Amino acid sequence: GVDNLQTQVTEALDKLAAKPSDPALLAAYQSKLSEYNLYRNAQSNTAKAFKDIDAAIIQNF
Expt. technique: X-ray
Query: How many domains are there within the chain?
Result: 1
Determine the Cα angle at 7 with ends 25 and 13, to 5°: 30
Resolution (A): 2.5
Burial of 55 from C-beta contacts in 10 A (0-12 / 13-18 / 19+): exposed
Instruction: Report how far apart, in Å, the C-alpha atoms of 28 and of each of 10, 16, 21, 53, 58 are.
Output: 11, 9, 13, 38, 45
Q: Which domain holds residue 21?
A: 1-61
